[PDB]
Subunit: 496 residues, 4 copies
């Protein structure tokens, strides 16, 4: 029952609508030889419309529903929504969405009477859907029910597992599409739930269009049988091999549709699901590396006017490593080598500093990531990062970090955050006010804080500096309610 | 030379000074029994003035000049000032200031000819004094010349020390003030450079007001002997013991000044220096944990219009904790335990009651351990263990191990404070009225320069207010302040010309 | 069932007992002003006798029975004895004794049909009593039944505890002896199971000799109620404080016995148990750091012919330090500093004066840090930093971080001690004369069973001798002793049929 | 001036000779189905002859002289031999061979009067050569003098470097043989010191026999010009690609000689050096992985009656990891996964225990080693090992170890130990006394503690358990002086 009402003339509330004005400021720079940056500022006005009518229940279809994140994600909503307390060594525990930014982080609205900061919930500024108001379903090439999937995953406490048994046992993933030549082969001891078959059972790559049709049906059917209107699809399945974006097949929307029709080799399963999600209007989020959103799939989006992902879920490991890495260069410390070893954004940093990273001294940072397979750990992901930096006058700093957690209990909550923010971003439209009222960008570029390969538009360097990404996000919600950026100048203190 | 010319009608240049208009917005909030935050914005206009004429030489006087940092400080200046390369098992190295945020750090000025961020050196926005212009000197309870101090310290490359030897030798710290009972006895047979001595050259905590007058004279002599105009004083000496703040004694200006004239067992060596520093109009920075800025001393700083800095140099293991811990609470992760070993997060446990409350708990186990081991040397080895909670019973154990040479990290931070406070001393502002044109004369930063908390463990903030420690937040303020002065808004980090086509 | 029949004329079997001949060689050495070691060999013949009839049930009584280890101890026995699988987020697990050197460890019997080492279970050489035959009981200053103890302890799988619940509940520790001043007050409101009470049921360190007689009776009752013959007592209770050994008091047998009858402020709870244990002829093992085996108590053990064990359970972080540190000095590497953090190597710094001497130095900085943090639970996190020296100025920094659940490591070690001491109680020897056939009657191990030092931090050795801590060395002795008893020589590890064709 | 004189009738000293008798004991086992190991003991008598005449100066020729170990190894002997104290941050330091077992470890001879252990130097039992009595030379495809090689290597303090400049600058590696197709290609920016050339300069593979001849010459020349008789050669160069051991070429001694003559493709540079060392009688030690000692090269050895290596120098990293690994299984702890990440013996452990490692529970241990290249560390080798074990009743132990050192200052001293032990082993011969007097085994199998791939004879499992390897070694020196094995029974204590 938390709310935020901001005394501002910049916000006008209409018919379950919200229009806010926003003077956006920035500037352009140009370094001359003489060693002087000329800075010319640039303002552009906007007006955002926020459809305050949020779904009483958001539909959620995960592609890879029976996986680790899939199963736990379902268990969480169930455990939380229904308040299932569970037993452990340390005693009974109460469900929650720890690790989830929207559900458990907080923001500063301003100061109180004494001059001290006041914090409010991330999701208490503007209305947002609650994961408990999620209705989940999805596909998976393996038919085990979400209870067996839980067991198999070994990520949840055995008590919190049994208490959910009954409810978890009723959930079953819809058969998925299985073009084997696109995943890490030998996922055949698993595939026993496919819609892509031929007259004689066997898995087939022929019929790529009917396969598409069948996903749209499952979407329609899901939306209908559950009586939902809003629904989001998240690919949280196997990582597929990329596909060649060659003209005549992957480029323009028409060719793509056609190529799916032609059963073309370059049409991956994630490709179908995507197109299928668009032709049905549901936002699609690709939480894996593969270049799903190829040119053609990106257009069929702009066209149908639906929203899309940013490629690859950013692990809580890549995040932390990005912060620290940023932390160092900020301080004026030149890391010179950074290694990662994990068994279950640097190049641009180098760009921000020409003091530390130049030719006379060297503008190179050694780095390497290593992911090894070790079954005997039980979901528990172990990652270790070694940073070697150069302090002044011959000095050196060595920070070795050893991170360890249940991996999924860290990934699941971030999946939720993407869903909640994707849905929220859906109800936002804008326009260059000016001294139509078009939606956002088909590419939801405010969800980068959760995506490792921030899908962007041409000639643009997506940024990473984690807290920057979270600040952009915070600063968005704020502008939406008539609040400016956080300046941290605390002048009612520094000043008399 | 790195320049940054910003085009705006908010900045005017008159008589070697910069005049920048600024509209400081903020907002006040109020909760409700029903749990509603009523946010009511706040705008207040200002007109800042930056004396552009930065001093040609910045006089600097350290207390603990012969210590690890004090000597390393002087070394680095000599090294960088005279580009003295040196030999390493790695080869000929060049002098630098890595670790110096004001020297080796960059701020973003915006985007370029295509939406690609453009950074400039932190020290390039507005004119700042460079460490290569510092005129270091100071005091120390030991007469060891700075060269000996280097050897004794064991921080710099033997070849480097060798190259600096000749010059470093001529630098000898002045006698300080030794009041035995304010520190340790292991550091007693080290005091052969004191000024509190009776006819029988023996330490005596009697005659304090005389010492107070002596230190003040030191400052004066230093100034004129180098032909300096500005001087900053920084206590980087040993850690004293807290002083019991009692009424009538050090609770108010005059009383402190008297408790001094009275040789009170509460007047510490630093207090004399602080008072001395203050009474001479030179800023004073407490780089040690002890609370030298007792109420009375602070009131003196106000009456005088001198600056002072929030206690204890924020090291590296600490800096990295208000980064690591922040990050975790910012992602909805609940750290439940934290242990620091080696040989403030309160404003976080409180910034989220979703995490910390009566139901789920609000206690976070922190515990530091600082054992000594002479072997390792100036190579402190810090180890931190973070045990946070994840949803549904899981946990996250982030154990960081980090070794390096403090003095090398601590010396540039000290260089930073100095550059930054000298900078602040040239900035004056003026509250402005939207209707009444020109409504005020300029003032100076409230004496307690909190713009320096980035480099300080226990931020010394004015009564009533709470000290914020978020490192990223502390830097931002430094940054927006500098932008603000050249006509740029705060960083919004939105990039709406990429997110919004 | 694992057997190991060795063929040799050194072993004879008569009347449920094993008779093995053995020639114990050793050598005495002497240095010289010129630095010459004159090594003069030593041979002494023996005839060992091993009562093969091991007890059908081994009575075991713990002091701290409701503690983390005591309860885990009983759990594991119940679990393994009745093969009680349990559920984990990993699946149905089977009970075991991993961590138990006598149960899950193997000894090499030699080579096979081709020079390929053949190992057999440590407990297979000679008959040893299995933990599944222990009859656990004991005392505790708190009446919490063992099931509650489990919950309270938080060491075992919730499902496991649940399965053991019904049986674990019926196990309730006997009242112990509480002498407030010998430990901590935080552990005072926990004492609701005491036997030292006046008419006003209040703790009283008066009547000690009565308590002494009470404990002795406990032992007796335990025995007959279970139909046991052998019983071992192990103190795994809280850590008391050392007792000032003073003449006339606890310096000699009778005096101790009197200082007891006299209620002396030096007689501790453990002392009463030790004396009680001893006076009843049951071996006694001190699994805590305090020195309960004062001279007088030891002399009592001699007069009585009972066994006793060297103070403090050698944990995991420790075991791994007398392995890591050994290894380094054995390779000519000189460790100069060592730090142990968490929430004896003397006989190494001395085993090499090439490394440690007046020239190069002989001081190694060690320093432990044991801070408490309730969050992490029974999951102690140990961190060790080793900073050794390498030739020509280099160094080697080996920093190990290791987390696990003590009780899980400490419980099998306790099982080991018990199996091992019960074993020793059945072994008797006899010094033999090479010329005079049959020259002696059998004796028993000198009361202070040092064969158990493998599992003990502060080895309690007999006066004059020094306590050796090399872990590998401690195990070897255990091993060669067992081999020796089946007719095998010590391990030479030469493999001359591979090195010498 | 330390010595050890043992009162024993087992040792008789003749003409600068030493003959000791040794009753060697062991036993044979055979596990029957019923679950019973039958143990039949087996004794074999021996008599070793130890030629007490040690070289007043041992010659040392390193193949790869200008490398890291090469240069430092030379610097150490020089620094120590000449007592060159050097300056550092912590002040003047005195040279020493720390890390060297023979030169700095110690052994127990027995107890003293009170019953307490007495220790003596590893090299104070029987006479052994001192590294200061080494005269070094060798080959290297790069001609830089050992001073430049020092600098390049960045392993030694800059003061201890300059003090050695003069002496180090006079040492230059003899040109080596350079068949590029055998090493990690592109070692051409280095090779500028080769004997294998043709009429027109360029490196060549043709003439493999003359190349051999030329090494023997350098050996003869070195031995002669320095007036030495004893000399050992140690390959401490690049790791070569293995070679196929095919009959008709690598098998019998004759074919090998012939194949070298035929310029056969399967004849590597290390192959030449080896054969060349043998045909000259000098022991050869291969401190690298490549299968140098192929069948043919092993015979030409037995034949010429010279001694050979054991393949690959055992790093102080593999050692420690082996101890700990052993430590665990000894305690009864079942490690289940062990990873290694290093950027600059398990299978048999699994065999020793069928309790912990069987089928019903699983007899597999996950493991992996990862060596990445990171130039910005300066010789400093960083290695990290993670062990995950299973304690009882659901428990788990996790020991993560982070090792760091100058790498070479750790490898060099072990090279010395091999040289000192190889030389010592040379002066040892034995015979199966019996109720000729042939030398050892061409394969010096007592130097395993220093070799990672203990070269052995057919159908034999070389052992590793580090301290076992060191004990065998200790137990050898002991038998040589009439002392038995260390039993640790301390009966003048346990017993009355």
């Amino acid at each position: 029952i938390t709310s935020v009402k901001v005394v501002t003339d910049k916000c006008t509330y209409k018919d379950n609508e919200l229009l806010t004005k926003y003077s956006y400021e920035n500037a352009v720079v140009t370094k001359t030889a003489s060693g002087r940056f000329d800075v010319t500022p640039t303002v552009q006005d906007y007006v955002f419309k926020l459809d305050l009518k949020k779904p009483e229940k958001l539909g959620i279809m995960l592609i890879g529903l029976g996986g680790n994140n899939g199963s736990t994600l379902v268990a969480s909503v169930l455990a939380n929504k229904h308040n299932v307390e569970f037993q452990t060594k340390e005693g009974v525990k109460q469900p929650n969405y720890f690790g989830s930014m929207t559900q458990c982080s907080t923001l500063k609205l301003g100061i109180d009477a004494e001059g001290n900061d006041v914090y409010a919930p991330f999701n208490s500024l503007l209305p947002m859907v609650s994961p408990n108001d999620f209705v989940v379903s999805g596909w998976d090439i393996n038919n085990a029910d979400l209870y067996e999937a839980m067991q198999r995953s070994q990520v949840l406490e055995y008590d919190l597992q049994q208490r959910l048994k009954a409810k978890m046992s009723l959930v079953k993933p819809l058969p998925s599409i299985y073009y084997p030549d696109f995943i890490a082969a030998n996922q055949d001891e698993r595939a026993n739930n496919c819609i892509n078959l031929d007259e004689k059972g066997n898995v087939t790559t022929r019929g790529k269009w009917t396969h598409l049709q069948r996903i749209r049906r499952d979407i329609q059917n899901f939306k209908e049988e559950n009586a939902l209107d809003k629904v989001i699809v998240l690919w949280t399945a196997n990582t597929e091999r990329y596909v060649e974006v060659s003209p005549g097949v992957n480029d323009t929307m028409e060719n793509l549709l056609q190529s799916i029709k032609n059963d073309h080799e370059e049409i991956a399963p994630s490709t179908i699901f995507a197109a299928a999600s668009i032709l049905e209007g549901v936002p699609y989020i690709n939480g894996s590396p593969q270049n799903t959103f190829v040119p053609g799939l990106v257009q069929l989006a702009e066209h149908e006017g639906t929203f899309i992902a940013g490629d690859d879920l950013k692990s809580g490991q890549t995040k932390l490593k990005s912060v620290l890495a940023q932390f160092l260069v900020d301080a004026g410390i030149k890391p010179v080598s950074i290694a990662s070893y994990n068994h279950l954004v640097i190049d641009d940093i180098i760009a921000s500093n020409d003091i530390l990273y130049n030719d006379k001294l060297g503008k190179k940072v050694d780095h390497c990531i290593v992911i090894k397979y070790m079954k005997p750990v039980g979901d528990s992901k172990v990652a270790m990062d070694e940073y070697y930096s150069e302090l002044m006058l011959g000095g050196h700093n060595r920070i070795s970090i050893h991170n360890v957690c249940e991996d999924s209990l860290l990934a699941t909550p971030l999946i939720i955050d993407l869903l909640v923010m994707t849905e929220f971003c859906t109800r936002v439209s804008y326009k260059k006010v000016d001294p139509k009222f078009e939606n956002f960008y088909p590419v939801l570029t405010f969800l980068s804080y959760w995506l490792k390969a921030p899908l962007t538009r041409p000639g643009f360097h997506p940024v990473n500096g984690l807290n920057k990404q979270r600040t952009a996000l915070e600063n968005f919600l704020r502008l939406l309610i008539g609040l400016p950026s956080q300046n941290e100048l605390r002048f009612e203190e520094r000043l008399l």
